[PDB]
Write a protein that binds this ligand. Structure first.
Ligand SMILES: [Mg+2]
Ligand SMILES: [Zn+2]
Ligand SMILES: [Zn+2]
Ligand SMILES: [Zn+2]
Lengths: 97, 196, 119, 83, 568, 563, 99, 143
DNA sequence: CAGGAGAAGGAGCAGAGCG
DNA sequence: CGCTCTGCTCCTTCTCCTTTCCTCT
RNA sequence: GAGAGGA
């Protein structure tokens, strides 16, 4: 799917997965880490190995979505409430002083 | 007293799911904004209103409800067009600290823009100010005193080190965080009853 | 293997100075002619800070007040656009931000040969 | 980016096994933190069994934010999802 | 012992990592323009050739209007050198570079004004020195000015005439030139453009040969390249004679800016005079100074004919440049001079009677003899074209000037033995330690100490000759070379970083004590320091001003020390 | 008073790898390790003032203090130090990167070796909207090849040849870089070649015995010259080399050892003293660096100084990686790489608590989705159940039972307190009476609890399944034989692991996704894999054989047997 | 610890975590490999992603951007070992909430 | 946590007092309420009030400060009503005050020539002919 | 101690252009 | 018309991986 | 550390 036939060795994986931590975990750790330090790679942790190494939640399985609890609050009380402030604020700029 | 408009994130534990949602939101906001100084804006009194509440979200390890909320808080911030009454708790020869009846006692006003005749007195600490042949116009402790606010000082710095914290604890700083500087350039100050 | 020109006394701690100790001879006391240049180096620089081409930056209440009224404006701020421009030099895309159609106004940077340094 | 309106929502109206397990886990975590239940308890004490019984009666008050790869997301109520 | 929590604060280690070019340019722009301009210049130096979209993307202050205001601020002050290229595949885009000459102009402002005042014989009259100082100050601070705006600013007719006359005199002298889009186009890209329209236009028939076709293209391109380079320096705008009263007046509509090449040629002349003051008498130094001032306008450019930067030097025909330069260096009509002109222009205050002893005023023979003693020295101060006719060889004087300045910097910083060792290695070539001891006559212990202390810079280079299969030590031998190019480049970078550090410290000190500095001009209370401020404020302001004065004096000294390495 | 404090939950968006620019190394540090000695040798082996085991870099003991956070071993995160070297040395990790940087630049002007149009085109290719690692590496390699094709500097006009490793040997030769300036000049006239000829003529006139070695002896790039060249590389020419110069530390000179970050003592603890390899290696580094610094001022022989410099370079190379030289130090590279390294032994697969491992035996009477557990291990495998007003009575009854009778509890953690209150002693009756509504009881594993039953090697996903626990007297994990086809269990002496999830989320996910009932089909083909094993098929065949004829009593007995 | 003479846990290695991944169990994976194995509350600076102690960045020396979060102690050890080499694993943080 | 607006529309020092009093009534923090149930008897219904210590303290202090004796035994705002506020706003809109110092004189009603002169800048210079005594006579009665 | 697979330098010719 | 670079293509010689762990001793 | 079951 990258365009060319790529193996499942440490050479064919290095041309598929950008994640430096995943490649280091698989094979050729120090070389990959030093190359990522030199070329200053900026991997975004989204793979399962990246999340496991950093103690996060994966993007596959039960971590592929979110759980949200409906607040269930009416729109008839969340409206702003005040007791006639605009009375004394009759826009004093309308008159001369 | 001036209404603010602050957006924050509120944690509602499952213990509070039974009551009204607005009640729990207000309870947590009060737990955060009851009698505390919001930096650069002053002291918040009470969460007044509540508007535009977004549906709560749950993080994958806690089980509470995290709600993004906006609200109008009640804060005190008089800048120039005001006259404020107060009491007296303690005075020394570096100015006078004016206190209230429990709101906050952080206002300290020196004798810079005060009456010219004011002077110090280590004994019967007071602010003697003759202004005439009669010199019996000293400021008494624990009485009404009116003053203006010319500027407000915000102490919002904290460059403290853990080693410094340990050293100060072993040896044990500017405690004030929201103070106002007073002025009494015009008359009518000192006591609301002195000027009729 | 300790070398021929070294002994155990001089080795044992790795103390690197971390502070320079070789100064250039340009640190001597200033001269009157050098004191002049400086002024024409402090003055220039001061003028361009006051100059319209700064954009250096990377109370003010909305409540109307009679106190702020009857008070003069601080100065007549001269923006970047108001300066006269030779249009054939600049790239075209910057024309929308200059004073292509704006009143001409140029500020003269007067030079005071008298030093502004205290004493 | 914004929430896709309820009128049209391509995501399957079914409830995937991952969503079901996550809903049960979240509801059991809430109940273990002394949360009110909306079913007849029948003497059950373990929060997971109470969560299962609540899901049996569709009484779990949670919704699912199905995050599409583009960034948008359809909010599906547990009551509306079918099993 | 100094803990790292204090070393990071009072050791100048955080700034020790910044690239000297980026550090210096960003600091200068921040001091003279602002923070947005400093950020834009920093992005330009770090990345190079950024469009507006890329500048917006690469800066947090990504306001398009803010970026465009910064770009116009840098362009009017010509701190940037844009480029408008047309994409064949679609929409055209304009890319901006960083202009080194504008930032140098910001750097040399005090020296520029000093040279303008001193070189023109108007400080003696004491009346229009202020006028010309204000003129050069406005020109250098506002970037580009047209004379009609400056004249309309003033009202007096006498002042208007004086300003116009000073404008004409300054433009004739060479310090002011007409500014054109050529000043806002990179020389490398200008040569790239000129390589085409002379190579593409060749007919598709057999050209002489592809190498000969490229040679023809280069030969044709160099001509109009030099012509368009010298076009601003032709005085084609000052000759608006006789609009009324038949006087020489500069054309009102032509914009004028400061000619940095002329000022740098003046700086080179001053450096040569200072060098000559260490080899000949005061009178002979004065003669050399006045000869340099006479030939200064007609001298070749300090940096290069602008072709070295444009393209690759050559396969080996880069020497042609030298030769070509040498040709002009010998055949520009203004360069060649005899003692008669010097005697004509020599000041009367010079004795020039008993200075020279025959054997163990304004005489032509004495001036010719002084020129001969200038030309006799191994340092090529002057060279003889015709019997009794001299010209100052700039091509053969740059290397010796650079070598002398570098050797004396080494002598001043390290010990004199360091200068001795550097000159011994330079005169010799690939010399071992035994031959160093034999031909230097000093202790080998101090020889090794000085060599180790000197290799820390790119002064002395170690050549390893391996005597085994492995190149490990204890068997190989170590010879020593000099590689003067490495030394010159490293010292130029070191001086650039030192200047940047001085400017950074000056700005930091100005910012830290900014309260009383602001109060000094809050109510126009300047000149009333003692009668309005507290004595502690007086002492603090005095110390701040003295520190800034010392900073700028040291910056001037650093400039005078690094200009020579900047030359080429 | 009491200014508000605001906190927000934040996750790891993503790492950004880079090196430290000798200014962050000092910034992180607490002490400069400037002493070869480790202990004071007078106050009973206390750590030195600025030695390798300095307390400010952390504490290696359980009864000392770190002098920087004033905590014990458990509460000390560990603090870094810095070690300033003399005569900088190459970084073994970035040595090939150093080779590439040298190949990409001149050696007189220290400028990149690509024409203006070529570098503009290459930067345009690099800044495409979508570029992965592979295309970027290909572009950088093409840039490197193009600049290797160049023969002259575009600015200095100096000859450039090939930059390569000296001999690729074992030790020093593997860290020596030689520049061959005169490889591409076949017969053309080159001024540099004539200067070379003149210099060697001079030295041979002085010393004629070196004629045989004039061959080879290329331009040698020691780390000091490499650093001085890297200090001059323009930032605008740094993106083509792969280094992002937008941020600080994005400079070619940050990849050469000028400061060694001395790791915290927690990273390199002392065992029973007996310091580990890293402390010894950095002690040797300090000693050799001090020797070099002293020899600089004492005017030692240049041969000795160069040899000590090379020894220091090899020492630090071994410190980073022990595979560099043959003449078993655990280098950071050893600590990371390998099957038992941090990535494959501590990050992707750890040792987990609340797990047991015992022999397995059959139990047909046990239903599938259930596993029998010994009560000898069901009384140590506690589950933390939180009081929730639905199980307060049950939890306080378990507390009353205690940690000995199986339906009991081991630990009690109060809502506000930190330390777990052990229920082994302390009148647990009143503790049960004082059971609040937020406390956590480590109740003993009981019937109906969820466990993860696993057998190694875990060839496929069905090698680990979620079972409901049951409690049985014996010492063997008993499971129904029907479910022994996934695990590939044998009962010949096999053993299995049993994990106990400690949260409601983990437990629910295990029992709903990994449950045995929900995993009756293998995922590779969808065909059932949990079904009748041996002797169950035999019983079924014997029952359903056509000869079978049962009267009413036998039929009813069979029906009460199946149920 | 690993052995039986030392009261130690059972290793859930690469094959077992891959099996857990196959089921798509994320919370169980997080609980097994972080919560029940090694959990450490570190303080990461929001500006320079380097871990700090006691709410102190030690590099910015500001304590304003310090954020407390829980990561495996093995990850913290890896970060410190990488920082001991010339590698900087600068952690960049983003809000979990706020859409 | 970001402050969307450092200052929203201004709040008169009458709505804050009634709002705080109503809040204390809802939370059963009234002096009469605490003296009735929480004092002099035991909680038969065990209807505990709201349990925020800091909020109770701050709201009691602010309501007491707003309900102190008027600084020339009540503060006037205590007995002020919404219709009295409407009458006051009509009266003040009939007058000329540049700033929202109308709310400032709502905060404190001194009803004195000196205090009214001091509260507003150049009262004599702006207007001091015949309406100043009208202001004093309508502010003497707090309604 | 074997097996597998890449990266890096010598090395030997085509090919192009040339004076 | 041989001569002299480039450039390509072999050819050789080098480097990084080889379940699960699960015990005891 | 390395010798060997073991499944
Ligand atoms: Mg078996
Ligand atoms: Zn510590
Ligand atoms: Zn070069
Ligand atoms: Zn930080």
């Amino acid at each position: 799917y990258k365009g060319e036939v790529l193996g499942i060795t440490r050479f064919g994986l290095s041309k598929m997965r950008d994640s430096v931590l995943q490649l280091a975990s698989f094979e050729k750790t120090t070389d990959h880490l030093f190359d990522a330090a030199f070329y200053m790679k900026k991997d975004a942790v989204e793979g399962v190995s990246e999340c496991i190494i950093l103690g996060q939640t994966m993007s596959i399985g039960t971590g592929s979505f979110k759980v949200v609890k409906g607040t269930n609050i009416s729109e008839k009380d969340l409206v702003p409430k005040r007791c006639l402030f605009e009375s004394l604020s009759n826009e004093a700029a309308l008159k001369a002083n | 007293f001036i209404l603010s408009k602050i957006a924050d994130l509120v944690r509602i534990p499952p213990d509070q799911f039974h009551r009204d949602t607005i009640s729990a939101i207000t309870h947590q906001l009060n737990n955060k904004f009851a009698n505390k100084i919001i930096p650069n804006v002053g002291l918040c009194i009470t969460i007044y209103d509540l508007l535009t509440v977004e549906e709560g979200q749950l993080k994958p390890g806690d089980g509470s409800s995290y709600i993004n909320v906006t609200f109008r808080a009640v804060v005190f911030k008089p800048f120039l067009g005001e006259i404020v009454t107060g009491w007296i708790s303690k005075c020394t020869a570096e100015g006078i600290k004016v206190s209230l009846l429990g709101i906050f006692d952080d206002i300290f006003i020196p004798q810079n823009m005060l009456f010219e005749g004011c002077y110090y007195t280590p004994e019967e600490s007071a602010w003697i100010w003759p202004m005439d042949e009669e010199t019996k116009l000293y400021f008494d402790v624990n009485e009404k005193i009116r003053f203006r606010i010319e500027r407000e000082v915000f102490v919002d710095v904290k460059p403290k080190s853990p080693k410094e914290r340990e050293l100060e604890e072993r040896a044990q700083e500017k405690p004030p965080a929201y103070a106002l500087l007073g002025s009494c350039q015009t008359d009518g100050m000192g006591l609301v009853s002195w000027w009729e | 293997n300790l070398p021929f020109g070294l002994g155990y006394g001089d080795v044992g701690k790795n103390h690197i100075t971390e502070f320079p100790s070789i100064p250039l001879p340009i640190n001597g006391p200033i001269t009157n002619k050098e004191r002049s240049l400086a002024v024409k180096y402090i003055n220039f620089g001061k003028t361009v800070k006051d100059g319209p081409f700064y954009t250096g930056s990377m109370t003010n209440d909305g409540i109307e007040r009679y106190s702020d009224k009857y008070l003069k404006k601080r100065k007549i701020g001269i923006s970047i656009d108001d300066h006269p421009y030779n249009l054939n030099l600049f790239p075209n895309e910057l024309y929308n931000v200059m004073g292509i159609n704006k009143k001409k106004l140029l500020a003269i940077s007067k030079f005071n040969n008298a030093d502004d340094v205290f004493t | 980016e914004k929430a896709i309106p309820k009128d049209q929502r391509a995501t399957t109206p079914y409830m995937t096994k991952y969503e079901r397990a996550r809903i049960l886990g979240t509801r059991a975590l809430q109940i273990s933190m002394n949360a009110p239940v909306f079913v007849d308890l029948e003497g059950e004490t373990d929060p997971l069994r109470i969560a299962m019984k609540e899901l049996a009666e569709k009484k779990i008050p949670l919704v699912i934010r199905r995050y599409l790869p583009d960034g948008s997301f359809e909010d599906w109520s547990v009551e509306e999802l079918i099993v | 012992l100094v803990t790292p929590e204090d070393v990071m604060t009072i050791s100048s280690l955080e700034q020790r990592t910044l690239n000297p070019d980026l550090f210096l340019y960003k600091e200068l722009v921040k001091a003279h323009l602002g923070e947005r301009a400093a950020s834009v210049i920093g992005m330009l130096v770090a990345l190079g050739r950024l469009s507006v979209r890329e500048l917006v993307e690469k800066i947090d202050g990504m306001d398009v209007d803010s970026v465009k205001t910064t770009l116009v601020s840098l362009t009017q002050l010509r701190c940037v050198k844009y480029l408008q290229e047309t994409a064949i595949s679609g929409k055209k885009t304009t890319y901006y570079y960083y202009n080194e000459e504008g930032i140098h102009i910001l750097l040399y402002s005090g020296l520029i004004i000093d040279e303008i005042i001193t070189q023109m014989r108007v400080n003696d009259e004491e009346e229009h020195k202020q006028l010309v100082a204000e003129i050069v100050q406005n020109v250098i601070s506002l970037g580009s000015l047209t004379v009609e705006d400056y004249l309309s600013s003033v009202t007096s007719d006498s002042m208007k005439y004086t300003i116009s006359s000073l404008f004409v005199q300054l433009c004739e002298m060479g310090y002011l030139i007409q500014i054109s889009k050529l000043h806002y186009t990179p020389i490398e890209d200008l040569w790239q453009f000129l390589y085409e329209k002379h190579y593409k236009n060749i007919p598709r028939n057999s050209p002489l040969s592809d190498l000969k076709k490229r040679s023809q293209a280069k030969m044709n391109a160099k001509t109009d390249f030099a012509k368009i380079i010298n076009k601003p320096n032709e005085l084609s705008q000052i000759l608006t004679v006789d609009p009324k009263t038949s006087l020489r007046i500069v054309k009102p509509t032509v914009s004028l800016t400061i000619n940095l090449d002329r000022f740098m040629k003046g700086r080179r002349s001053k450096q040569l005079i200072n060098l000559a003051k260490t080899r000949v008498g005061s009178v002979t130094a004065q003669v050399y100074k006045i000869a340099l001032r006479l030939t200064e306008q007609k001298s070749p450019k300090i940096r290069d004919p602008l072709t070295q930067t444009g393209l690759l030097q050559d396969l080996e025909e880069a020497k042609s440049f030298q030769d070509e330069a040498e040709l002009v260096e010998e055949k520009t009509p203004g360069l060649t001079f005899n003692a008669i002109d010097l005697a004509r222009h020599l000041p009367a205050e010079l004795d020039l009677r008993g200075s020279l002893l025959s054997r163990k005023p304004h005489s032509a023979s004495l001036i010719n003899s002084h020129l001969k003693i200038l030309a006799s020295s191994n340092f090529p101060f002057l060279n003889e074209t015709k019997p009794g006719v001299y010209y100052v060889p700039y091509s053969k004087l740059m290397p010796v000037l650079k070598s002398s300045v570098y050797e004396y910097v080494i002598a001043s910083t390290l010990g004199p033995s360091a200068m001795r060792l550097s000159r011994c290695i330079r005169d010799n070539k690939l010399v071992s330690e035994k031959i160093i001891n034999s031909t230097a006559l000093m202790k080998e212990k101090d020889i090794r100490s000085t060599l180790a202390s000197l290799i820390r810079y790119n002064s002395v280079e170690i050549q390893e000759v391996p005597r085994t299969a492995d190149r490990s030590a204890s068997r190989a031998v170590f010879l020593f070379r000099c590689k003067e190019t490495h030394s010159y480049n490293f010292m130029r970078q070191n001086l650039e970083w030192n200047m940047a550090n001085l400017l950074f410290k000056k700005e930091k000190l100005k910012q830290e004590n900014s309260t009383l500095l602001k109060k000094a001009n809050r109510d126009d209370v300047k000149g009333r320091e003692n009668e309005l401020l507290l004595p502690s404020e007086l002492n603090q302001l005095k110390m701040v001003n003295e520190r800034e004065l010392n900073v700028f004096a040291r910056l001037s000294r650093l400039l005078s020390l690094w200009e020579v390495f900047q030359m080429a | 008073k009491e200014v508000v404090v605001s906190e927000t939950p934040k996750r790891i968006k993503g790492l950004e790898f880079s090196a430290l620019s000798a200014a962050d190394i000092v910034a992180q540090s607490e002490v400069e390790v400037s002493t070869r000695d480790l202990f004071d040798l007078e106050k009973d082996r206390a750590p030195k003032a600025n030695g390798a085991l300095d307390p400010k870099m952390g504490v290696s003991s359980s009864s000392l203090e770190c002098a920087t956070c004033h905590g014990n071993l458990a509460s000390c995160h560990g603090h870094f130090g810095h070690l300033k070297l003399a005569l900088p040395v190459f970084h073994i990790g970035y040595f090939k990167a150093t080779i590439q940087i040298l190949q990409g630049i001149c050696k007189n002007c220290s400028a990149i070796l690509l024409s203006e149009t070529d570098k503009r085109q290459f930067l345009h290719e690099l800044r495409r909207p979508g570029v992965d690692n592979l295309r970027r590496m290909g572009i950088l390699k093409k840039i490197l090849d193009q600049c290797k094709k160049q023969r002259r500097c575009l600015h200095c006009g100096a000859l450039n040849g090939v930059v390569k490793k000296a001999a690729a040997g074992a030790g020093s030769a593997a860290l020596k870089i030689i520049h061959d300036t005169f490889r591409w000049v076949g017969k053309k006239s080159a001024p540099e070649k004539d200067i070379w000829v003149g210099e060697w003529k001079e030295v041979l006139a002085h010393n004629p015995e070196l004629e045989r070695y004039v061959k080879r002896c290329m331009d040698d790039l020691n780390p000091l010259k490499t650093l001085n060249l890297f200090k001059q590389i323009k930032s605008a020419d740094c993106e083509l080399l792969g280094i992002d110069a937008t941020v600080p530390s994005g400079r070619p000179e940050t990849y050469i050892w000028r400061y060694l970050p001395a790791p915290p003592v927690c990273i390199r603890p002392s065992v029973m003293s007996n310091e580990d390899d890293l402390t010894v290696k950095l002690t040797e580094i300090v000693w050799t660096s001090s020797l070099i610094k002293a020899g600089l001022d004492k005017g030692i022989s240049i041969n000795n100084m160069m040899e000590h410099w090379d020894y220091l370079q090899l020492t630090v190379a071994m410190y980073i990686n022990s595979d560099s030289v043959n003449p078993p130090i655990r280098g950071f590279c050893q600590r990371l790489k390998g099957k038992q390294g941090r990535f494959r032994g501590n990050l992707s697969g750890k040792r987990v608590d609340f797990s047991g491992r015992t022999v397995i035996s059959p139990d047909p009477n046990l239903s599938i989705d259930e596993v029998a557990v010994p009560d000898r291990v069901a009384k140590v495998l506690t589950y933390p159940e939180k009081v929730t007003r639905y199980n307060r009575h049950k939890l306080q009854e378990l507390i009353v039972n205690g940690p000995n009778v199986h339906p009991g509890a081991n630990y009690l953690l109060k809502r506000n307190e930190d330390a777990r209150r052990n229920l082994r002693y302390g009148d647990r009756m009143k503790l049960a009476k004082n059971l609040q509504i937020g406390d956590v009881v480590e109740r003993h594993l009981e019937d109906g609890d969820v466990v993860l039953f696993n057998r190694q090697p875990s060839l496929h996903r069905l090698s680990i399944l979620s079972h409901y626990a049951k409690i049985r007297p014996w010492r063997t994990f008993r499971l129904n034989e029907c479910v022994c086809t996934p695990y590939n269990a044998d009962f010949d002496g096999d053993e299995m692991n049993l994990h106990v999830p400690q949260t409601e989320e983990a437990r629910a996910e295990a029992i709903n996704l990994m449950g045995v009932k929900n995993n009756l089909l293998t995922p590779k083909s969808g065909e059932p894999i949990i079904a009748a094993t041996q002797d169950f098929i035999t019983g079924s065949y014997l029952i359903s054989h056509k000869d079978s004829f049962y009267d009413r009593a036998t039929l009813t007995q069979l029906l009460s047997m199946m149920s | 610890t690993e052995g039986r003479s030392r009261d130690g846990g059972l290793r859930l290695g690469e094959m077992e975590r891959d099996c857990v991944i196959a089921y798509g169990a994320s919370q169980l994976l997080l609980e097994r490999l972080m919560i029940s194995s090694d959990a450490f509350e570190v303080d990461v600076c929001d500006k320079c992603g380097l871990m700090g102690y006691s709410g102190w960045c030690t590099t910015c020396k500001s304590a304003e951007n310090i954020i407390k979060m829980t990561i495996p102690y093995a990850a913290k050890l890896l970060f410190q070992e990488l920082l001991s080499m010339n590698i900087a694993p600068r952690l960049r943080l983003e809000d979990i909430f706020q859409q | 946590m970001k402050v969307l607006e450092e200052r929203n529309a201004f709040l008169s020092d009458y709505e804050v007092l009634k709002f705080l009093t109503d809040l204390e009534k809802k939370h059963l923090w009234d002096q009469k309420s605490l003296a009735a149930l929480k004092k002099s008897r035991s909680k038969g219904k065990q209807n505990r009030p709201y349990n925020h210590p800091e909020l109770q303290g701050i709201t009691r202090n602010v309501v007491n400060y707003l309900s102190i004796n008027k600084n020339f035994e009540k503060s006037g705002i205590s007995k002020m009503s919404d219709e009295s506020f409407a009458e006051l706003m009509t009266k003040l809109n009939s007058f000329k005050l540049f700033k929202a110092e109308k709310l400032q004189i709502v905060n404190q009603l001194p009803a004195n020539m000196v205090h009214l002169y001091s509260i507003v800048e150049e009262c004599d210079a702006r207007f001091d002919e015949k309406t100043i005594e009208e202001m004093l006579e309508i502010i003497s009665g707090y309604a």
